[PDB]
Write a protein that binds this ligand. Structure first.
Ligand SMILES: CCCCCCCCCCCCCCCC(=O)SCCNC(=O)CCNC(=O)[C@H](O)C(C)(C)COP(=O)(O)OP(=O)(O)OC[C@H]1O[C@@H](n2cnc3c(N)ncnc32)[C@H](O)[C@@H]1OP(=O)(O)O
Ligand SMILES: CCCCCCCCCCCCCCCC(=O)SCCNC(=O)CCNC(=O)[C@H](O)C(C)(C)COP(=O)(O)OP(=O)(O)OC[C@H]1O[C@@H](n2cnc3c(N)ncnc32)[C@H](O)[C@@H]1OP(=O)(O)O
Ligand SMILES: Cc1cc2nc3c(=O)[nH]c(=O)nc-3n(C[C@H](O)[C@H](O)[C@H](O)COP(=O)(O)OP(=O)(O)OC[C@H]3O[C@@H](n4cnc5c(N)ncnc54)[C@H](O)[C@@H]3O)c2cc1C
Ligand SMILES: Cc1cc2nc3c(=O)[nH]c(=O)nc-3n(C[C@H](O)[C@H](O)[C@H](O)COP(=O)(O)OP(=O)(O)OC[C@H]3O[C@@H](n4cnc5c(N)ncnc54)[C@H](O)[C@@H]3O)c2cc1C
Lengths: 607, 607
């Protein structure tokens, strides 16, 4: 039972902070009320803590085994039993479109439900993303393809996203897998893809939809020349869904990884074994990179939310350990060798550690749920008063924060969780070292942190003309401008907001200097990740302070018992974060204001 | 070649061109070891480390030790035992051993540079080889009779352990309850269970193991002052001839399953619980256990810090070699051109940022442990610093928790950049970086957690010392700042020195004000680790800048070729470190000056 959930904080964000319940029972969510949403969260949290978390250790210690002659993978039995628990509850259809068998709901509620699976056994959610992919295929498909997507969703087929090649990882546009058009309008896909998650999955599903980027013969170069293809593991009857002949797409290797071991990560060979890999052009148009980014956006949201879910259960494990571990005397009695021994939560450095973990875990939860409130036009209208166009641009702005800042932060603060256990934290008997291993990948797949920071600056700020950024900054400034019990926190936030504004101005400055001296663009690259992390810190501190303001109101109204303790912890967290994390942004702004190209001019031989 | 990439060039640069250790080679204690021989020794052990020692790095992780409950022994993988035999056959387990025990006299600074290579290539191999060094400590603390046993133990190459920790006594060594009962013949029977004992069994590597066990004589007082230290051998032996006799009652009962460092058997150790007494001999025949054991702990803390630093160094050189060859993307100056030539990733600004961060910290940390070691011999300290024996010992004691605490935390943090440089391939066991990360996570925990390092540094190495060692080091930094091409670095170092000075003053004020307000002491606890880390960053910046001043002198004298590249890299690293790492200490000073007890007052239930 490694997984420790936090429904209370989820509901606090969804209802008391963001007001997502304002849309429940109205319009698209007419048949889902606030009580039902709360019961779903409790239900999936309990299932996550039980049957899903049950095989978390098994999947790591008894990982999938590859048979290279059948080109298939065997998963451990306990993990497949967790997968069936997921399917039997319908949790592979959270927020799926109603016409595909789904229950309509705000994306903020959907991601909070998913948080529990990602905290308990994140590879289980990844294997279960087939219906979500069926829905993207549906939205992008022809009328006839929409009929296959409906079948795939109803039969619960698995799915993969197939981009990476050995020479084309960050540079997707360099891929050489090719597509050869047939007279009847299908295509034959030829190439080897690498690092494909779930490319085989034992007997979990009756079929797998591979969504494959490939370059049609004679198409131009880069990502703009790529097309997206529906390549099923098995041919099937397009009218009934009955499974047919094996299609020419075969796993030829399974990687040995640091963590996330139960997710089979596969070399995938298309058309290499003398059987054609038939693919159907998605939507029967050539628009591959744009179509595939519908998938990439969801994957990046998932990876950020995965890292955040894992830091949260890492923190709650550390806290429960610390509450019970007796070691040493209180610091006020450190010289008295007969003083009473105390539990380690009495020690300042452990409280520092735990509050650092708490504030980042909770601030990150607020960030991904805040981000999700812009993913439905109706939620964004009802809770923020912003129209659909700006909501989409704000969601797109925040996705690289959820992914890049979420993955980096969670991994770094799990170091504090492990440390809280002392030497025991190094044992596989406790789950934190596996949290660390399982979460290292989140800075890498779905685009590395450097790729997230480059997306954030060039596409989500500059190409956006700063409109989404200016929107969020205006909300932060409005909080600062508005009791004086948060006076010191608002002053710290004001300094941090000006620090980030100063970073944006410097980086924009280097970009405009590149009109005259091309090399000046390198300074944007030097400072981009630090800027992305600074915006994440500023958002964490703002959202914690918002949570603190709500908590003050609820305490003033007369909260008691466990509610009172919860609200007290929000005040302490927002105050701790403002005073210990935000001021570092000032030094980071001055560092960014002084970047230079010395490190770019250095001979490679001098490293 | 192997996973292990060594850096003898940087070691020799530090030892000779920066600290002038070659000035003592050939004279007095080191009469028979000249500079040429020292360099050939470093080259020889580097090749041993890259060859047979590194050969079983992966194997000890993938095929880890197995506990046998039928015999209460541990079995080690055959390839790792072959590596151990290569270490012994070359005499490398007698590096810096006293001449009368069979060693080769050498400066401690040379000794630790030699040991760095084993710690980089397979650090558990050095840990299993620490027997002869423990015999020397037993010799130094022993009676005349006991010195004869310690001589035999060195000559026969017996293994050794340091046996302190119990389930309820880890950081708080003084809570130990293992008991010592004196026998009529003047031996003792030791009774208790110890936990997490490194090398507590080692298969058939040795013919005997010396366990150095802390235990509380019946009737003694509480805390660490009531502990005594006992020589408890695995087998009884003839005190004159060394011939091995009957088994003594000290048995391993389990082996821990760990995140990393798997080939180091970490064992529960039972004394007197299996039907025969564990006979022990009181060391020095005096009751002075925690003082005696700290002779061992001091060495273990130097070892752990040097291990973490060795591991970052080979992590960096692996990532750098990968980056030079990995082609991905276009030059940022050609971002918008999708037919622009592809480049190797060292052309990308974020990768150069990541590599220079790894390089500056790895080399700064190497400078710190070598500098620390130049204070471990009175003669070296006199010859290269002009300091007498008493001040030397105090400065070495000041620097040890920096080597250990700042070393372990920094190495694990910056290996994250090493892994990131490989992209998705960094997450594969095919490359050594993910094992580096798992193997080095323990360095912040054993030999005293980081918080214990930070408390030792401030309470014992500064306050109890009345700032003598600290003022000495600060005066050497100020002298460098005092002194054109290094004007900016010296200005940034002056800011960092004043920041650390401000931190020390604030924390000393919180401590002294505890006399009138007891809870004031908690702010010392809240800030101690950040203070320790700030001193390590300041030392790193200063030593790198000193290196850059030597590099400038050598370039002015006409260095060419590979020498010139090396020197250019030192100037670049010192400058990058001063401009990108040092300024953050200003925000950390201001954070420390505003610490408060809110987080101490918060109800535990609010977390
Ligand atoms: C809910 C269910 C989801 C279904 C899931 C089913 C199976 C999967 C389950 C398992 C999960 C596994 C998680 C790990 C997965 C992976 O790693 S998949 C591989 C991920 N690969 C990447 O993320 C690529 C990283 N590299 C880049 O992003 C790089 O910056 C790119 C490739 C974009 C650079 O290429 P360029 O050619 O230089 O890009 P350019 O800027 O000019 O844009 C071209 C074109 O791309 C579109 N685009 C680009 N960026 C975005 C963003 N951020 N969002 C949307 N669209 C984007 C645009 O079409 C753009 O053209 P324009 O004319 O509009 O500019
Ligand atoms: C090269 C040869 C080496 C041989 C090695 C052989 C075996 C091979 C394998 C070993 C490698 C594996 C590495 C991992 C091994 C381990 O983890 S062993 C377990 C390590 N345990 C610790 O480090 C303890 C951590 N806790 C503390 O340090 C804690 O702060 C202590 C225990 C010090 C607090 O106890 P107190 O009683 O409160 O301490 P106090 O401050 O009052 O001092 C009491 C007494 O202790 C001595 N002392 C304390 N601190 C030091 C230091 N830094 N240096 C020397 N001596 C110290 C003093 O005697 C002191 O008395 P005073 O009157 O002088 O104050
Ligand atoms: C467990 C796992 C599962 C995966 N699953 C899938 C999957 O299901 N589907 C799929 O299509 N792919 C998948 N991948 C591939 C994954 O997305 C890539 O590994 C990732 O995009 C990084 O690419 P790469 O490994 O080639 O690294 P590289 O692109 O070679 O990057 C190496 C280094 O160079 C840096 N770099 C590269 N280009 C630039 C640039 N222009 N500017 C600055 N820095 C740059 C990177 O940040 C990194 O630090 C998976 C990978 C892993 C590890
Ligand atoms: C791989 C491994 C090998 C080991 N080898 C040996 C060996 O050979 N010999 C041996 O004797 N021991 C050995 N140990 C034990 C090791 O030194 C201890 O784990 C370590 O000292 C921490 O003690 P603990 O595990 O009981 O943690 P705890 O002392 O319970 O610490 C728990 C947490 O509380 C914090 N904390 C505790 N006390 C205080 C305080 N007073 N103030 C502030 N914070 C505090 C710690 O920093 C940590 O975050 C080994 C351990 C491991 C993991």
């Amino acid at each position: 039972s490694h997984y420790k959930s936090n429904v209370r904080d989820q509901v606090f964000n969804l209802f008391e902070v963001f007001g997502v319940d304002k849309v429940l029972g109205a319009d698209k969510f007419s048949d889902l009320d606030a009580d039902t949403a709360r019961e779903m969260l409790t239900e999936i949290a309990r299932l996550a803590e039980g049957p899903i978390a049950e095989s978390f250790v098994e999947g790591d210690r008894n990982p999938p085994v590859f048979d290279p002659e059948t080109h298939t993978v065997t998963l451990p039995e306990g993990f497949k039993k967790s997968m069936r628990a997921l399917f039997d509850g319908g949790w592979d259809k959270v927020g799926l479109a109603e016409h595909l068998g789904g229950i309509p709901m705000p994306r903020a509620l959907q991601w909070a439900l998913i948080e529990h699976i990602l905290g308990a056994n994140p590879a289980a959610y990844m294997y279960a993303m087939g219906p979500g992919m069926s829905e993207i295929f549906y939205n992008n498909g022809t009328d006839e393809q929409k009929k296959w997507a409906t079948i795939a969703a109803e039969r619960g087929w698995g799915a993969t996203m197939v981009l990476t090649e050995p020479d084309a990882g960050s540079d997707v546009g360099a891929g050489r897998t090719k597509a050869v058009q047939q007279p009847d309008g299908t295509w034959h896909i030829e190439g080897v893809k690498r690092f494909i998650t779930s490319a085989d999955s034992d007997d979990l599903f009756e079929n797998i939809m591979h969504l494959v980027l490939a370059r049609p013969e004679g198409a131009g170069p880069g990502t703009k020349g790529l097309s997206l293809f529906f390549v099923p593991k098995f041919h099937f009857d397009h009218e009934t869904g009955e499974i047919g002949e094996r299609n020419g797409v075969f796993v030829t290797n399974v990687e040995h990884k640091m963590g996330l071991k139960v997710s089979a990560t596969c070399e995938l060979s298309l058309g290499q074994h003398g059987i054609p890999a038939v693919g159907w052009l998605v939507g029967e148009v050539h628009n591959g990179i744009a179509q595939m980014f519908d998938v990439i956006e969801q994957a990046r949201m998932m990876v950020g939310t995965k890292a955040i879910a894992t830091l949260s259960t890492g923190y709650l494990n550390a806290l429960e350990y610390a509450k019970e571990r007796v070691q040493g005397a209180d610091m006020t009695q450190m010289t008295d060798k007969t003083a009473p021994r105390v539990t380690i939560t009495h020690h300042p450095d452990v409280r520092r550690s735990l509050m650092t973990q708490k504030a980042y875990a909770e601030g990150l939860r607020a960030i991904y749920l805040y981000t999700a409130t812009f993913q439905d036009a109706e939620v964004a209208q009802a809770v923020h008063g912003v129209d659909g166009d700006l909501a989409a641009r704000v969601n797109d702005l925040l996705l690289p924060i959820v992914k890049g800042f979420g993955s980096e932060t969670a991994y770094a603060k799990l170091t504090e969780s492990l440390q809280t256990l002392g030497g025991s934290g190094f044992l596989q008997d406790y789950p934190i070292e596996q949290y660390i291993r399982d979460s290292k990948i989140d800075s890498l797949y779905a685009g590395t942190t450097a790729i997230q920071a480059q997306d954030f600056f060039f596409r989500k700020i500059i190409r956006d003309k700063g409109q989404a950024l200016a929107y969020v900054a205006g909300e932060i400034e409005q909080f600062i401008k508005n009791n004086g019990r948060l006076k010191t926190e608002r002053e710290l936030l004001a300094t941090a907001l000006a620090d980030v504004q100063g970073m944006a101005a410097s980086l924009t400055g280097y970009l405009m200097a590149a009109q005259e001296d091309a090399a000046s663009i390198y300074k944007v690259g030097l400072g981009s990740v630090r800027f992305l992390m600074a915006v994440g810190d500023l958002l964490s501190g703002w959202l914690l302070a918002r949570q603190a303001a709500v908590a003050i109101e609820k305490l003033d109204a007369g909260a008691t018992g466990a509610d009172k303790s919860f609200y007290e912890g929000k005040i302490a967290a927002a105050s701790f974060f403002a005073k210990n994390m935000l001021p570092l942004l000032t030094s980071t702004r001055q560092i960014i204001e002084n970047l230079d190209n010395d490190v770019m001019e250095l001979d490679e031989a001098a490293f």
